[PDB]
Each structure stands twice: as C-alpha cells, then as structure tokens.
Amino acid sequence: INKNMKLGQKVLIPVKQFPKFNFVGKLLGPRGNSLKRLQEETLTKMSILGKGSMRDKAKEEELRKSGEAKYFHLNDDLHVLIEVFAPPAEAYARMGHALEEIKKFLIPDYNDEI
Amino acid sequence: GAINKNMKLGQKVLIPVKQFPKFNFVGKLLGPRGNSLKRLQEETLTKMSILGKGSMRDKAKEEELRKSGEAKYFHLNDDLHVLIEVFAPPAEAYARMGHALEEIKKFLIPD
RNA sequence: AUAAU
C-alpha cells in the first residue's frame, strides 16, 4: 500500500466524430501552455500522441517508418496519454482527477439543455 | 478509451501476514457477519474479495481446493490479498479505486 | 474459531 507505482491511461481524442474541431489547439491553449498547467494541477504527466500529434506530417511519417519504439505511438489514433507515479491510493486519485479535468477539453457538444 | 464508456480496473493489495504473523487480518477486514468489508465496499462503490493463502475459514478445505487444480482456486497458491475491482467511466473508476485504497489502509495495520 | 464473496 506504500510503494510508488506507475499507472497510464490513454484517452481518445474524437477527431473522427468531430473533424471540424481543433482538439490539439484547444488542449495546448492560446499560448500553448494549457496542458502544462493541467499536468501541474493534477500532478500527472500528459502527452499528446498519435496521428496528427506532431503538427509536422512529413516528419511524423518518417518517424513512424523508422520503427523506433519511442514512436510506436504514431501508429495509433490521436490521444492523450496520462501517466502517474505515486503510492497506489494517490496514483489512482490523481488519475481520476486528471481524467475529470480533461473531459471539458474533449467534448465540443456537451449538454446545455435540461 | 473514450472518456465516457464504462471500464474495468482491478488492484491487488497485499495483506502483510509475513510481516505480522500473529495478527488476524481476515477477521479484522470482515468484522461481524462480514459487515466491515461489506460497508467498505458500499461506501467506496467497489467490489472487494479476500483471496490467497489464508483466505478461507477452513485450512483443511483450503488445502483440498488448492490441490484440485480448478482455476477458480488458483488464487489459493498466491499470497493473501484483497482484490479491489471497479466498473465505471474512467474518471469515476480511478477515483473510486483511489478512495478504496485509502480506506483499506487502516485495516492493514495491526491492533 | 469476527468469515463476506
């Protein structure tokens, strides 16, 4: 119950469902640091990964073709990888709180009628 | 996954019987009629199962089921533990688990 | 023999 443990969770960014919405720009923010704040606030690490995550389509296709394990993620769908390293109770709580906080960044059409 | 679909999480928590061989962790977890562990589950919105060597009321029977090699009893070859399970959308599933893991700590200190 | 599942 006391030792640091690692957890990781992929969250799909629904680009197919909402192709007109710029999820990456919305995640990173107007100055590009919104995701940095979100991480520091939640005590997690968050990385935007998958097809489209590099904002350089030539380079992305190059790294994917290399077969280096660092870039395996580029085979995947666009997503945020949330990672945490803390004792079990804190690790799960942090993840729960990060997953909650990230929801607003990923739903263009949230309900606003009752 | 998508942020909305129900997901399953499971976490084993070791009961430190080796460290504290004199202490009845199982009785402490269950309480009278199992209502301690039942309450703890209901409060945390988790499922909890006590599993592993030492889990069963009955040491003769335990050894029998272990020897059967039925897969439902494989756990009896493992160390004593609580398996905490949850099924809910990702943010709620992780929160529940974090809260269960916090609440269970006091039961895994002897006195 | 705190004994749930």
Author numbering:
A (entry chain D): 50 to 163
B (entry chain C): 48 to 158
Reproduce, without paraphrasing, sentences from the article in which this PDB structure was first reported.
All our structures of T-STAR in complex with RNA display a very similar mode of RNA recognition, and show that the KH domain specifically recognizes three nucleotides with the sequences U1A2A3 or A1A2A3 as illustrated for the structure of T-STAR KH-AAAUAA where one KH domain binds the 5′-AAA and another KH binds the 3′-UAA moieties of the RNA. The base of the nucleotide A3 is specifically recognized through intermolecular hydrogen bonds with the backbone atoms of I97 in β-strand 2 mimicking a Watson-Crick base pair. The base of the nucleotide A2 is specifically recognized through an intermolecular hydrogen bond to N71 side chain. Additional nucleotides located 5′ or 3′ of the (A/U)AA motif are visible in our structures but do not make specific contacts to the protein, suggesting that only the (A/U)AA motif is specifically recognized by T-STAR. Strikingly, no electron density could be observed for the QUA2 region of T-STAR in all our data sets, suggesting that the QUA2 region does not adopt a well-defined orientation. Interestingly, the presence of the QUA2 region in the STAR domains increases the radius of gyration and maximal dimensions both in the absence and presence of RNA. This is consistent with the QUA2 domain being flexibly attached to the QUA1-KH domain dimer, and may explain that no electron density is observed for the QUA2 domain in the crystal structures of the T-STAR STAR and KH-QUA2 domains. The absence of electron density for the QUA2 domain in our X-ray data sets suggests that the QUA2 domain of T-STAR does not contribute to RNA binding. Altogether, our data demonstrate that the QUA2 regions of Sam68 and T-STAR are not involved in RNA binding, in contrast to the other members of the STAR family SF1, QKI and GLD-1.
